[PDB]
Amino acid sequence: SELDQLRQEAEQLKNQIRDARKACADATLSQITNNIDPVGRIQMRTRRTLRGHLAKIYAMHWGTDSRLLVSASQDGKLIIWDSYTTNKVHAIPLRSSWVMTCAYAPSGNYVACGGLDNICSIYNLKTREGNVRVSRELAGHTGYLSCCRFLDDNQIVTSSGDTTCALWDIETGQQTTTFTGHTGDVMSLSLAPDTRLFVSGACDASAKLWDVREGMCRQTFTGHESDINAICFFPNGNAFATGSDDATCRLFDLRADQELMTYSHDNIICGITSVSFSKSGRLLLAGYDDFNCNVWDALKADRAGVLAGHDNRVSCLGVTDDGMAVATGSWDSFLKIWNGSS
Amino acid sequence: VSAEDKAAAERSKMIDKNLREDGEKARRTLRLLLLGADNSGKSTIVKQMRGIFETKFQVDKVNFHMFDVGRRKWIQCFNDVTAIIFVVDSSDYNRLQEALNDFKSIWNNRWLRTISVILFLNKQDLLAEKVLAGKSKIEDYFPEFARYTTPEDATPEPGEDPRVTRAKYFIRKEFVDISTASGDGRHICYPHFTCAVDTENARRIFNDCKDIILQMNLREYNLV
Amino acid sequence: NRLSVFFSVIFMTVGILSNSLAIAILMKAYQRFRQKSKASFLLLASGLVITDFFGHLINGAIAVFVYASDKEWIRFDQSNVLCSIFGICMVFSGLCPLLLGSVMAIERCIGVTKPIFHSTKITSKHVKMMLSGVCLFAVFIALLPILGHRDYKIQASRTWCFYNTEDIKDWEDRFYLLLFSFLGLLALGVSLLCNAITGITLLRVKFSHHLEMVIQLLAIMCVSCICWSPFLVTMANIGINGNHSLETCETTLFALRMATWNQILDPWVYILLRKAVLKNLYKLASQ
Amino acid sequence: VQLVESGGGLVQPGGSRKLSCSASGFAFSSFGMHWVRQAPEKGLEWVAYISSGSGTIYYADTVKGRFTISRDDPKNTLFLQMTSLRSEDTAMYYCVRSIYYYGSSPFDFWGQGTTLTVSDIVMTQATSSVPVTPGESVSISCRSSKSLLHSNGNTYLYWFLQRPGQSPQLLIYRMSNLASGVPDRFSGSGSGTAFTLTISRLEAEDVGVYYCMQHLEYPLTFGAGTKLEL
Amino acid sequence: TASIAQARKLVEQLKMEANIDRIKVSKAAADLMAYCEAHAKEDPLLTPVPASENPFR
Ligand SMILES: O=C(O)CCC/C=C\C[C@@H]1[C@@H](CC[C@@H](O)CCc2ccccc2)[C@H](O)C[C@@H]1O
């Protein structure tokens, strides 16, 4: 009786939201950006090849200096690279080799990683002893760790396969806030530039916008037909892009609370693993299962170019803070640094 | 290149040397993935031979490292294991169709297309007793079992009841039928009949892994 | 009569094209297989095809130069530097493919008979060391007459330089002929022994890719022995019987050209004449 | 982090002596090691360098052929074998650790030193002494014969402070970066061949001798040193 | 009473999401287009820099 009545009210509320989104869907992003000129052909060359990983690379993250990056592989090795010289700055042996994510602290003093061990391990890069040591192990997730991102040296946000995201206090080792509401494994998260909000994509084909301080879900974004694997905030924080296994990328708007554009091609039938934006946000770069990285025009939904330099799945990618280069990691155990030439 | 850059580059080469030394050490062991249902009894298979549970056992001076995670997302991590040890409980007729669908997902997974499955049809003693009692009928769950006959080329074990032999080959055929429906030789299923006291499981994995590695080499020698 | 300019050009052209074609396929295929395993066969097969590529190039260019110079060795090689260089290249271009083929036979015999030992114990460094050690050993044998105060002499055809075979008197002069023939026969014998063991094991195990590999092994054994034995026996006959042997210039020259076709057919019988490769070449031709 | 030197003492001219440097509290095998000596009432002088992994070894010209530097990583001991000792070798020998990667701070820790008694880019610090008062800003100037700015953007200039009775301490590395544990009042500014160390709000602890060292190339050379007195 | 407790929570969440202020899609699209135009010049991937200014020559 009461349960049946309540679940009918949820359907009415869903229709109310759907009508509300349709009310503000006066125009389409495609119509708005029809007049602007295309970005042309985007040609990027492999400037650097980072060799030394002996297994599948699962994650990479640039440091804020746009020169150092950390990559994670399932050989149980965290490696910090000097991208300018390809020198290896550090090689961190992982207690659990089944790592799936890695994060570089914005200060550059810490890196984080974690995988099927359900632990987010914090590593101190600046010690008087001259070696990298574990400073914290963040326990509390009941599923694998899929993504992690620092807010500062003391706060980090992690997404897990136990359908929840958590905000952690690194000094005390306790999760101050738990973000619940996803019905599937959360595969990725992206922080807003002001670090007051973050979006997460799960395997329930939905993206949720979370308030860090308040700790609740502000908006829910649906429209994908399969698991979401990647998510990335727009550089101004008012939009984000997702990548799913249905071979499509979608651009959702926070304030309009709906999808604005879909990035798919008929030839593309493979899943998407990673997404990122260029510094101005005009380009959306996505890594694919078909061994390629497609550069999309975010505004016009045009495939601007292709990065074809890997012999296995493109598992991760990232764009530097200064926008100078993009790194691609792959299951073929190599990392490549790309940028164009005049 | 400055004086500090040379010292930095020399540090990088010392890192690269230890990266290769650890990689070669990791290749000296064969990695196995243990899968199965709750009633499979895969733990008992491991214990007799001996978030992630790991066990190391050695057969003829060869080290095996088997991982029992205790799933379409994290199964991609084990994309480069030597073999998958999929265990089922053949006695429980009710959950056999669940195991067949579970096996079908693993076999047809996009990230396990080159991973051979070492099937372990566990708890054969219970299956033999269940058929002997006759209280439960396999035909109730599988209608096609009533029209199935033991192959003439079959080689039953000595002292084995023909009723049990007909049942065992039917259950094995269902898994083999899934295996032979796709793959085209990229991966091969290696079914086995094991019980709760069998102590030859480790050697069966070792012998099957020799064929899995040999099949890997033959593709290298031929697909050039 | 039996010797002509076009004889060396055709052998060089087919050898260069066949080796260059196999090099491209080996490079693309290695990246595919380096992820699954160390791909020891692909490394060795790449070294063999590269070594044969230079053999048809370095020795082919010198041979064409001699033919173009009207075979005037005295007029244009007074210092005898070219013949010394020519002799070293010929020994390297003939003893390295024999030794490399004998190592692939051993390498693939271990991989088939003991796949676990090959996969775990043998590392990529061992394969590169074996590939480097074989190439260096061929160079060392090639340079042995130079370090032994001897020199390579112009053969009867006056088109290729090699060990002196006419009127050998000193025991050191006949020792080099025996050493080259013994190494060629020992490498040939080891190749047959290991290929036969691999072929027998595959047939026993088979009774998917077993029959395709067996045809490859039989084709390797036939080409390796038919092409090289007429030359290895000729050197052994001259090394033992000396000038008393009825080894005419025509017999020695013909046996040389058979041994050349082993390097021409190495890319095909090892790489190109494969079911997967032919489909790729067929698709490439259509496109 | 500790670096203890031993083996020094009075030796006859032309003799031999073995200096040891035992390291504790840090990963010794990860750091390159230098020997730096200081003649009595004189400035610092670099002696030798051995890299991490013992693959690279450098010597000063005045000691090359007579000194041998070696390390024992399992025992965390640094050695300096000296032969044909001259009266010019009478100095206090310091054991210095230095690790080299992007953003590292070489020459960050110095040992207490051991005393030995026997019976090229030019770095200039013209101002030998500077009278100072507490709370007042002080600037120290350094000059180099060659430009220390490399094509990679780094300027390999270092600043050290040796308080009376104490071993030198790193203040500024690569001409601008502030070493760990150093107050922010110290600031390093430079360009090309001219460099300035500014000390705002001078305190009693800042009193001492200041040395500027170049690390552009070997041999590493020190300035004469500028002494601060009240 | 697990299902009835979850139903109240799910309904309560949908109320919060339905009470937010939504701007027009044309307004939201223009803001994204405006940001790309304003920051276009400082995007090296969109407009490649001269080789002298490229750290990855
Ligand atoms: O004058 C005539 O016609 C004959 C003589 C020409 C001169 C050189 C032959 C060349 C061939 C050598 C290939 C390479 O593999 C060495 C083989 C070999 C080594 C050692 C002992 C026996 C044989 C190339 O193919 C092109 C060219 O023909």
Q: Please name the residue that has the structure tokens 């003391």.
A: A154
Candidate from B24, B28, B216 with C-beta closest to C37: B216
The helix/strand/coil state of C93 is: helix
Q: Do D1 and A128 touch (CB under 8 A)?
A: yes
Task: Count the residues in chain E.
Answer: 57
Q: Which two tokens stand for residue E54?
A: 């490229």
CA distance between the termini of chain A: 69
Q: How far, in Å, CA of E34 to CA of E47, rounded? A: 17
Is the domain of D138 the same as that of D64? no
Q: How far, in Å, CA of C142 to CA of C177, rounded? A: 12
Assess contact for A338 and A44: CB atoms under 8 A: yes
| DSSP states of D66-111 | TEEEEEETTTTEEEEEE-S--GGG-EEEEEEEE--STT--TT-EE-
Q: Which helix (H) or strand (E) holds B37?
A: none
In a domain, D230, yes or no: no
Q: Do A89 and D1 touch (CB under 8 A)?
A: no
Nearest 5°: CA angle at A48, between A45 and A52?
Answer: 140
Q: Omega into C230 within 30° of 0, i.e. cis?
A: no
Q: How far, in Å, CA of A187 to CA of A275, rounded? A: 13
- For chain A positions 155-194, those within 8 Å of chain B (CB to CB) are 161, 185, 187
Q: Which chain D residues are Cβ-neighbours of A105 within 8 angstroms?
A: none
Is the domain of D84 the same as that of D143? no
Q: Do E48 and A47 touch (CB under 8 A)?
A: no
The helix/strand/coil state of B54 is: strand
Residue D28 DSSP symbol: G
Strands B120-122, B83-89: pairing is parallel
Q: Which amino acid is at A227?
A: D
Is the domain of D54 the same as that of D87? yes
Q: Which chain D residues are Cβ-neighbours of A124 within 8 angstroms?
A: none
Nearest 5°: CA angle at A288, between A282 and A294?
Answer: 35
Provide the angle, in degrees to the nearest 10, between the axes of the packed helices C171-206 and C124-147: 160
Q: How far, in Å, CA of A145 to CA of A96, rounded? A: 12
**Closest chain A residue to C35, measured at CA:** A332
CA-proximal residue: ligand 1, atom 10 (nearest): C60
Pocket-testing residue among C83, C260, C263, ligand 1, by greatest number of atoms within 8 A of Cβ: C260
Q: Is A91 at the interface with chain B, CB within 8 A?
A: yes
Burial of B120 (0-12, 13-18, 19+ CB in 10 A): buried
Q: Which chain D residues are Cβ-neighbours of B8 within 8 angstroms?
A: 100-102, 104
The helix/strand/coil state of D211 is: strand
Q: Which two tokens stand for residue A7?
A: 């679940």
Is the domain of D103 the same as that of D195? no
Q: Is C24 at the interface with chain B, CB within 8 A?
A: no
Q: Ligand 1 within 6 A of C19 CB?
A: no
Give the Å distance between the CA of A113 and the centre of ligand 1: 60
In chain E, how long is the greatest CA-to-CA distance? 69
D225 in the Ramachandran plot: left (φ > 0), alpha (ψ -120 to 50) or beta?
left
In a domain, D227, yes or no: no
Q: Which chain B residues are Cβ-neighbours of A185 within 8 angstroms?
A: 73
Q: What is the 3-state secondary structure (H, E, C) of chain A?
A: CHHHHHHHHHHHHHHHHHHHHHHCCCCCHHHHCCCCCCCCCCCCEEEEEECCCCCCEEEEEECCCCCEEEEEECCCEEEEEECCCCEEEEEEECCCCCEEEEEECCCCCEEEEEECCCCEEEEECCCCCCCCEEEEEECCCCCCEEEEEECCCCEEEEEECCCCEEEEECCCCEEEEEECCCCCCEEEEEECCCCCEEEEEECCCEEEEEECCCCCEEEEEECCCCCEEEEEECCCCCEEEEEECCCCEEEEECCCCEEEEEECCCCCCCCEEEEEECCCCCEEEEEECCCCEEEEECCCCCEEEEECCCCCCEEEEEECCCCCCEEEEECCCCEEEEECCC
Taking residue D97's Cβ as centre, other Cβ atoms within 10 Å add up to: 25
Q: Which chain D residues are Cβ-neighbours of A126 within 8 angstroms?
A: 180
Q: Which chain D residues are Cβ-neighbours of B7 within 8 angstroms?
A: 32, 51-52, 56, 100
Q: Ligand 1 within 6 A of C184 CB?
A: no
Q: How far, in Å, CA of A52 to CA of A42, rounded? A: 29
**Closest chain C residue to A309, measured at CA:** C31
Assess contact for B127 and B167: CB atoms under 8 A: yes
Give the Å distance between the CA of C29 and the centre of ligand 1: 30
Could you give the domains of chain E? 4-56 (4.10.260.10)
Domain ranges of chain C: 5-286
Burial of C235 (0-12, 13-18, 19+ CB in 10 A): buried
Q: How far, in Å, CA of B51 to CA of D187, rounded? A: 50
Distance from CA of A214 to the nearest CA of B (A): 30
Q: How far, in Å, CA of C284 to CA of D20, rounded? A: 69
Assess contact for B33 and B81: CB atoms under 8 A: yes
CA A321, A324, A328, A329: dihedral to nearest 10 degrees? Answer: -60
Q: Ligand 1 within 6 A of C155 CB?
A: no
Residue from A236, A306, A240, A230 nearest A268 by CA? A306
**Closest chain C residue to B25, measured at CA:** C120
Q: Which two tokens stand for residue C241?
A: 């019987």
- CA distance readout (Å), A12 to B101, E11, E15: 37, 10, 11
Q: How far, in Å, CA of C191 to CA of D3, rounded? A: 61
Chains C and D physically touch (3 or more Cβ atom pairs below 8 Å)? no
Contacts of A144 (CB under 8 A, 6+ apart): A100, A115, A116, A117, A118, A160, A161, A185, B51, B73, B74
Q: Do E55 and A36 touch (CB under 8 A)?
A: no
Last residue of a domain, which of D118, D145, D175? D118
Strands A249-253, A258-263: pairing is antiparallel
User: Class of the B3-221 domain?
Assistant: alpha beta
Assess contact for D209 and D227: CB atoms under 8 A: yes
Q: Which domain holds residue D195?
A: 123-222
Taking residue A222's Cβ as centre, other Cβ atoms within 10 Å add up to: 16
Q: Please name the residue that has the structure tokens 């243990």.
A: B34
Q: Which domain holds residue A103?
A: 34-339
Is the domain of D58 the same as that of D160? no
Nearest 5°: CA angle at E29, between A286 and A42?
Answer: 35
Candidate from A90, A126, A129 with C-beta closest to D26: A129
Q: Which two tokens stand for residue D109?
A: 């820790």
Q: Which two tokens stand for residue B193?
A: 């009949």
Beta bridge partners, A133, equal A124
Assess contact for D27 and A130: CB atoms under 8 A: yes
Q: How far, in Å, CA of C108 to CA of B179, rounded? A: 29
Q: Which chain D residues are Cβ-neighbours of A130 within 8 angstroms?
A: 26-27, 30-31, 99
Helix count (H) and strand count (E) of chain C? 10, 2
- CA distance readout (Å), E19 to A215, B39, B86, E12: 18, 49, 50, 11
CA D72, D73, D78, D80: dihedral to nearest 10 degrees? Answer: 40
Pocket-testing residue among C8, C224, C227, ligand 1, by greatest number of atoms within 8 A of Cβ: C8
In a domain, A218, yes or no: yes
CA distance between the termini of chain B: 41
- CA distance readout (Å), B88 to B118, B160, D205: 11, 21, 75
Q: Look up the CATH number of the domain holding residue A82.
A: 2.130.10.10
Q: Which two tokens stand for residue A58?
A: 């699962």
- D-interface mutation test, from B1, B2, B4, most D Cβ less than 10 A away: B4
- CA distance readout (Å), E3 to C3, D60, D227, E9: 95, 80, 79, 10
Give the Å distance between the CA of C63 and the centre of ligand 1: 8
Candidate from A85, A116, A185 with C-beta closest to B51: A116
Assess contact for A185 and A145: CB atoms under 8 A: no
In a domain, A159, yes or no: yes
Q: How far, in Å, CA of C181 to CA of A319, rounded? A: 62
- For chain B positions 48-87, those within 8 Å of chain A (CB to CB) are 51-52, 69, 72-74, 77, 79-80
Residue from A246, A241, A259 nearest A296 by CA? A241
The helix/strand/coil state of B75 is: helix
Is the domain of D169 the same as that of D72? no
User: Class of the C5-286 domain?
Assistant: mainly alpha
In a domain, A88, yes or no: yes
Method: cryo-EM
Q: Which chain B residues are Cβ-neighbours of A87 within 8 angstroms?
A: 8-9, 11-12
Contacts of A212 (CB under 8 A, 6+ apart): A151, A157, A167, A177, A195, A196, A197, A198
Q: How far, in Å, CA of D67 to CA of B14, rounded? A: 26
In a domain, A22, yes or no: no
Q: Which two tokens stand for residue B113?
A: 């297309």
Q: How far, in Å, CA of C210 to CA of B43, rounded? A: 36
Number of A/C CB contacts below 8 angstroms equals: 8
In a domain, D207, yes or no: yes
Burial of B142 (0-12, 13-18, 19+ CB in 10 A): middle
Structural domains counted in chain A: 1
Q: Do B15 and A88 touch (CB under 8 A)?
A: yes
Q: Ligand 1 within 6 A of C231 CB?
A: yes
**Closest chain C residue to B212, measured at CA:** C115
In a domain, D228, yes or no: no
Nearest 5°: CA angle at D74, between D70 and D76?
Answer: 60
Q: How far, in Å, CA of D229 to CA of D130, rounded? A: 6
Using CB atoms, which chains have 3+ pairs under 8 A with C?
Answer: A, B
Residue B143 DSSP symbol: G
- For chain E positions 21-50, those within 8 Å of chain A (CB to CB) are 22-33, 35-36, 39-40, 42-46, 48-50
Taking residue E36's Cβ as centre, other Cβ atoms within 10 Å add up to: 26
- CA distance readout (Å), A242 to A160, A227, E27, E34, E45: 17, 10, 21, 21, 20
Assess contact for D54 and A158: CB atoms under 8 A: no
Assess contact for D63 and D46: CB atoms under 8 A: no
Q: Do D180 and A128 touch (CB under 8 A)?
A: yes
Q: Ligand 1 within 6 A of C92 CB?
A: no
Q: Which residues in chain E are immediately followed by a break of C to N over 2.5 Å? A: none
Q: How far, in Å, CA of C201 to CA of C206, rounded? A: 8
Q: Which two tokens stand for residue B189?
A: 């299923």
Q: How far, in Å, CA of D126 to CA of B113, rounded? A: 74
Assess contact for C134 and C96: CB atoms under 8 A: yes
Burial of C17 (0-12, 13-18, 19+ CB in 10 A): middle
Q: Please name the residue that has the structure tokens 């700015």.
A: D149
Give me Rg for the CA atoms of chain A: 20
Beta bridge partners, D191, equal D194
Q: What's the half-sphere exposure (Cβ side, CA atoms, 13 Å) at B216?
A: 29
Give the Å distance between the CA of B222 and the centre of ligand 1: 29
Which stretches within C70-155 are classed as H helix?
Answer: 73-76, 81-113, 115-120, 124-147
- How many angstroms is the resolution? 2.8
Contacts of A243 (CB under 8 A, 6+ apart): A201, A228, A229, A230, A231, A249, A272, A273, A274, A275, A286
Q: Ligand 1 within 6 A of C59 CB?
A: yes
Q: Which amino acid is at D206?
A: D
Q: How far, in Å, CA of A125 to CA of A109, rounded? A: 5
Q: Do E23 and A256 touch (CB under 8 A)?
A: yes
Q: Ligand 1 within 6 A of C260 CB?
A: yes
In a domain, A285, yes or no: yes
Q: How far, in Å, CA of D88 to CA of A296, rounded? A: 70
Q: Residue B93 phi/psi, 5° resolution?
A: -70, -30
The helix/strand/coil state of B39 is: coil
Strands B83-89, B29-36: pairing is parallel
Q: How far, in Å, CA of A287 to CA of C47, rounded? A: 35
Q: Ligand 1 within 6 A of C235 CB?
A: no
Assess contact for C116 and C136: CB atoms under 8 A: no
- CA distance readout (Å), E13 to A184, A200, A218: 17, 17, 9
Q: Is D27 at the interface with chain B, CB within 8 A?
A: no
| DSSP states of D140-185 | EEEEESS--B-TTS-B-EEEEEE-TTS--EEEEETTTEEPTT--TT
- CA distance readout (Å), D17 to A141, B81, C53, D9, D92: 60, 58, 60, 9, 14
